[PDB]
């Protein structure tokens, strides 16, 4: 409201009147917290597609690493 003559949380209905994507590796003991993938955080035009591709790549790499772990253990 007016600054000089000081209406806190008037309930401001925002439903009467009218997605985000992360790098998929925020919380994972295998994904390094620090890495060059951090630079993906400053991409805007194709953020959805770039992060989707990154998520797919990390999914596949983790799955293949786990498959090798199981194969090495069993062999």
């Amino acid at each position: 409201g007016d600054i000089y003559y000081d209406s806190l949380h008037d309930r401001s209905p925002t439903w009467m009147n009218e997605r985000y994507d992360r790098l998929y590796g925020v919380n994972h003991p295998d994904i390094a917290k620090i890495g060059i993938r951090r630079h993906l955080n400053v991409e805007y035009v194709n953020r959805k597609e770039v992060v989707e591709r990154d998520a797919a790549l990390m999914k596949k790499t983790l799955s293949s690493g786990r498959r090798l772990r199981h194969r090495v253990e069993s062999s």
């Binding site: 008037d10 401001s12 209905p13």
Partner: peptide, 12 residues
């Protein structure tokens, strides 16, 4: 206080 529409119509 007043909501947005209440304020709008009071000003009207």
């Amino acid at each position: 206080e007043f909501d947005a529409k209440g304020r709008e119509y009071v000003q009207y």
